[PDB]
Design a protein around this ligand. Structure first.
Ligand SMILES: Nc1ncnc2c1ncn2[C@@H]1O[C@H](COP(=O)(O)OS(=O)(=O)O)[C@@H](O)[C@H]1O
Ligand SMILES: Nc1ncnc2c1ncn2[C@@H]1O[C@H](COP(=O)(O)OS(=O)(=O)O)[C@@H](O)[C@H]1O
Ligand SMILES: [Ca+2]
Ligand SMILES: [Ca+2]
Ligand SMILES: [Ca+2]
Ligand SMILES: [Ca+2]
Ligand SMILES: [Ca+2]
Ligand SMILES: [Ca+2]
Ligand SMILES: [Mg+2]
Ligand SMILES: [Mg+2]
Ligand code: NA
Ligand code: NA
Ligand code: NA
Ligand code: NA
Ligand code: NA
Ligand code: NA
Ligand code: NA
Ligand code: NA
Ligand code: NA
Ligand code: NA
Ligand code: NA
Ligand code: NA
Lengths: 510, 510
């Protein structure tokens, strides 16, 4: 179908004859420079390559308010997710309309020249409730208030180059490239599959089922820009993707990476994804259960209903200009060893089986077996390798403030005790002395599978520098992960307590 | 590098706006029509897509002659393999210069319009001697004499479309498409690897070494058009290539199929391959041992010296404009568990191991084990599935003319006996009644793994219609594969001789 709004706004093509000139302006001594954030990098690439057509820059207050309240750009164009350049007061104060700012990547690579239209201070609570449904634990809201600048800068963009990427040079196709790919294959019907998670048997079946339903070739279009915090990394996922694409009949599927930054915005996001897939050359788009939804909040309640996205998308059906292929929960059928949409079964008579993501993380954490029917063996292998079970995981034991015993001796005892277990883990007594340079390496070691014995705590102001993953507190306090009986509990007694705790939590298996 | 001759003669692009017009002409009642042969389809695709630049059609007597005697086109351009349109006397006689013939595929798909420049009867003896070195067993010479037309038609082409292929839709990249694939990845140095055989450890190793020495990315460019008679089918080889591509470091290699029709003309073909790969965008081309060589004839003598191709290519070095990366025999060193060119070892103090194609076929024929050091397991599995061991192979037993026992009864006896053994094979008593429509089916059954019991011989003038693989003659004559003691030998006695013969040759295993 035609790109949204009718014209693929591929600004790299458009501005090809201005590259040299633009390149020089960005590197000039007098121009104002803004280093793009990782989310702004994902967005600008989608803007510059035509993926966000009809967009040609970051939204000004007028288009943004319309998107916020109407799910449309000022001119009525259907657009549900606001794409804005968020900066701080300090930088904002340095600009006015007509100003030309140069946008860089890593303070080295010039990306584009932005021509300012306006500078405004959005009300984040309206944006938070209107676009994302207001729940503070929502990834998009949490980001909006804790990471995004308080000032947005609207303006038109002029391309210099798409953001740099060194992984998968050939796989990140632009809308124009993907289109030639389909074309060279004479693919006039293509159903796209959005995904930010690894694909399992269920996913493979619903995509093939969609291919057969729509008489279309299959496009696996995974997101490799930002997704939901805690997701399985994109490198591990590409490997899972490149592995599962081989379980499709030869010549039916095509894999392409999408550097999009999701907002995990359920129904609104699905609408957005469809627009994006149409721009990329798909004629059909899949929207399954809880599409782009972030699950449930700490209180156990749904951010979106399991089929809100399908409903919202269904309502814009006639103006989307891309065919939506909906699916109800596809589940496994033990008694028939096959997969099928829950809306075509049940009513009792047939038993169904499902393994939730929570159940999988857990199987991966304990080293438990994962059913041959659930996923493909080689996919499970790739997942176990990058998300190793507890006995292969790193961890840190932090000697609390309350300790009265010898910190030097308690550390040595823990180090020697741990070293006698063996099993390939590397241990170290780690002194951070409250230095950020050091504090920030803690999670690197844990990520490497190492066990760190930490002699004393870091001051509270520094706490934010350290991830708390697999970091455990030894102390007399009630908030200690490993609770001491007394501040001066003898060393041997403490070592046993720590050893058995680490074993109870699977770090040690004898 | 620049295409051979300066311009990529991509006639599909050149004639894009003439497509509808050329199609109309091609389908007019009046126009003379010639249906392309398989080799011609291979050659026409390479001419129409620019793979054969500077060629823009099939050679006229002038260029053809130059090439045969001079390894150059009339204008001096280096070119070693004549590419001509061979037709029969009947067709040639209707042709006149300045005429426009329509070239079709499968007598239905119009491929191109040929404007004739001349029609001539080449001296096939000179061509066989000068271009293919004269041995009558050389595939190129056998083809030249038993299949190719006796008249050549030189003329320029106007493209309607490249030949149709429904297998591997996106893998047959045209020179323009590959050049784009490379550019999108920023690949400016690419070393190409030619091949018509499955790839094993040695091949992976030499292509990577080539990548390292030349500081270039890798292009696996296998031939999927005509190759040597008896080669592993291209579908099987493609699966092999697709599997082995995964054993290269991520992002270092690209797979692209080449619809070339080889002539197995060693050194001359090597130069030709260099020119072709240059046209497809490669900056380097690998030339190993006995490049494009068909091996040895009947008397065991070599068609080419193992390094003639390297010598010829070297002598045209400054003309080729594509860097040749030569390799001496790459072999296995058991004691160091690695592969290496033989020129950089031996000293008669270093052990080397190798498995010839002959040794491999054989290991596959008996279901023998293949060293994990020789090839990757996934590759071997694919090879066994397509070229299965004798117990999984089909065969035919032909009751010879000499036989005086009941053909009907001997047939049933053989059928009932084979059926006792089980093992999956399907058996049928097959009466051809000397009808070629039936005789032509014998090899399909053998190909299907079946056992055929054929009660009587077919006319001598029909032998050509029937393949020879796994077809055995039961007779009293010396030419019998299973020789009877007398034409009236009792059935049970004949049955035992047959059963034990098939066991001796592996078809049955108890
Ligand atoms: N079991 C399932 N049944 C139906 N749809 C599913 C199922 N699992 C995943 N999907 C769909 O697969 C697509 C991508 O899935 P995910 O990667 O888990 O999440 S999402 O955020 O990209 O939507 C979505 O359309 C989603 O609704
Ligand atoms: N063991 C080897 N050592 C060096 N070169 C080899 C070896 N095996 C194959 N080659 C080279 O690999 C390329 C393709 O090999 P083949 O498919 O067997 O035959 S060819 O007809 O295309 O040359 C050729 O350059 C050939 O000379
Ligand atoms: Ca703020
Ligand atoms: Ca729910
Ligand atoms: Ca005490
Ligand atoms: Ca003849
Ligand atoms: Ca030899
Ligand atoms: Ca007798
Ligand atoms: Mg990029
Ligand atoms: Mg073709
Ligand atoms: Na349209
Ligand atoms: Na820097
Ligand atoms: Na709802
Ligand atoms: Na419409
Ligand atoms: Na439809
Ligand atoms: Na416990
Ligand atoms: Na026909
Ligand atoms: Na002669
Ligand atoms: Na060089
Ligand atoms: Na020689
Ligand atoms: Na040159
Ligand atoms: Na024998």
């Amino acid at each position: 179908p035609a790109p949204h709004g009718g014209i693929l706004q591929d600004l790299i093509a458009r501005d090809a004859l201005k590259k040299n000139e633009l390149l020089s302006e960005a590197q000039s001594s007098d121009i104002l420079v803004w280093n793009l954030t990782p989310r702004q990098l994902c967005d600008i690439e989608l803007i510059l390559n035509g993926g966000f057509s009809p967009l040609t820059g970051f939204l000004n207050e007028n288009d943004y308010s319309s998107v916020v309240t109407d799910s449309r750009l000022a001119d009525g164009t259907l657009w549900t997710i606001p794409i804005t350049l968020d900066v701080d007061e300090a930088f904002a104060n340095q600009i006015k309309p007509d100003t030309r700012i140069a946008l860089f990547q890593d303070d080295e690579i010039p990306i584009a020249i932005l021509t300012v239209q306006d500078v405004y201070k959005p009300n984040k609570t309206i944006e938070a409730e209107r676009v994302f449904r207001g729940d503070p634990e929502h990834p998009a809201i949490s980001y909006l208030f804790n990471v995004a600048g308080d000032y947005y800068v609207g303006g038109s963009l002029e391309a210099i180059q798409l953001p740099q990427h060194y992984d998968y040079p050939g796989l990140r196709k632009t809308p124009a490239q993907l289109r030639l790919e389909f074309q060279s294959r004479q693919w006039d019907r293509v159903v796209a599959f959005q995904t930010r998670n690894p694909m399992h048997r269920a996913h493979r079946e619903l995509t093939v089922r969609a291919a057969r339903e729509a008489n279309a070739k299959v496009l696996i279009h995974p997101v490799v820009g930002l997704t939901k915090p805690g997701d399985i990394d994109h490198h591990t996922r590409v490997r899972v993707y490149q592995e599962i694409i081989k379980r499709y009949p030869n010549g039916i599927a095509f894999l392409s990476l999408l550097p999009l930054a999701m907002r995990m915005s359920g129904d609104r996001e699905a609408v957005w994804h469809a627009i994006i897939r149409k721009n990329y050359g798909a004629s059909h788009f899949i929207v399954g259960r809880d599409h782009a939804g972030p699950g449930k909040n700490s209180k156990g309640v749904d951010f979106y209903g399991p089929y809100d996205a399908q409903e919202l998308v269904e309502s814009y059906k006639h103006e989307l200009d891309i065919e939506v292929v909906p699916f109800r929960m596809v589940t496994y059928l033990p008694d028939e060893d096959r997969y099928a949409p829950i809306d075509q079964i049940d009513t009792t008579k047939t038993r169904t089986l499902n393994i939730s993501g929570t159940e999988l993380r857990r199987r991966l954490r304990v080293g438990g077996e994962i059913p041959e029917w659930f996923s493909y063996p080689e996919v499970v292998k790739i997942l176990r390798e990058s998300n190793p079970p507890r006995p292969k995981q790193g961890f840190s034991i932090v000697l609390g403030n309350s300790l009265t015993v010898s910190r030097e001796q308690l550390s040595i005892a823990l180090l020697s005790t741990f070293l006698q277990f063996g099993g390939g883990r590397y241990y170290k007594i780690f002194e951070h002395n409250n230095k950020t340079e050091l504090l920030s390496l803690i999670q690197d070691f844990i990520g490497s599978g190492s066990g760190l014995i930490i002699p004393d705590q870091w001051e509270d102001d520094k706490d934010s520098v350290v991830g708390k993953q697999n970091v455990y507190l030894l102390d007399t306090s009630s908030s200690a992960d490993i609770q001491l009986e007394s501040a001066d509990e003898p060393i041997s007694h403490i070592v046993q307590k720590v050893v058995l705790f680490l074993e109870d939590n699977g770090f040690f298996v004898f």
